[PDB]
């Protein structure tokens, strides 16, 4: 978990945006799928319209986004023993507030239990 990526902006976004979804966990339920579970932020205006769950492969520089309205989503159609980043974002009438820290996780290897 190497955090640091910052932005060179001498300004600030809105003033009423959602917060980072706590209890952000991620585990590979399968060598071709991944289950991600998160919680709702105690801080925020009104209610979150929909939860945006991003997912990408470590070394693609092409993050994606999927529409989700639950506290648990499963992403299938993935490689075996491959790493994948994940991040949750709150989208409300106001706008996309802060973004949770990237959550990279390696999927199960079909080859064998070969300890890594």
Swiss-Prot record:
Domain of life: Eukaryota
Location in or out of the cell: Cell membrane
Tissue specificity statement from the Swiss-Prot or TrEMBL entry: Widely expressed and also in cancer cell lines.
Domain Fibronectin type-III span(s) in chain numbering: 20-110
Family that this chain belongs to: Belongs to the immunoglobulin superfamily. DCC family.
Assembly: Interacts with MYO10. Interacts with RGMA and RGMB. Interacts with BMP2, BMP4, BMP6, and BMP7.
Function statement: Multi-functional cell surface receptor regulating cell adhesion in many diverse developmental processes, including neural tube and mammary gland formation, myogenesis and angiogenesis. Receptor for members of the BMP, netrin, and repulsive guidance molecule (RGM) families. Netrin-Neogenin interactions result in a chemoattractive axon guidance response and cell-cell adhesion, the interaction between NEO1/Neogenin and RGMa and RGMb induces a chemorepulsive response.
Other comment: Knockdown of NEO1 in C2C12 cells results in the enhancement of the BMP-2-induced processes of osteoblastic differentiation and phosphorylation of Smad1, Smad5, and Smad8. Conversely, overexpression suppresses these processes.
Domain notes: The Fibronectin repeats 5 and 6 mediate interaction with RGM family molecules.
Protein name (record): Neogenin
Organism whose genome encodes this protein: Homo sapiens
Region of the whole protein represented: 529 to 631 of 1461
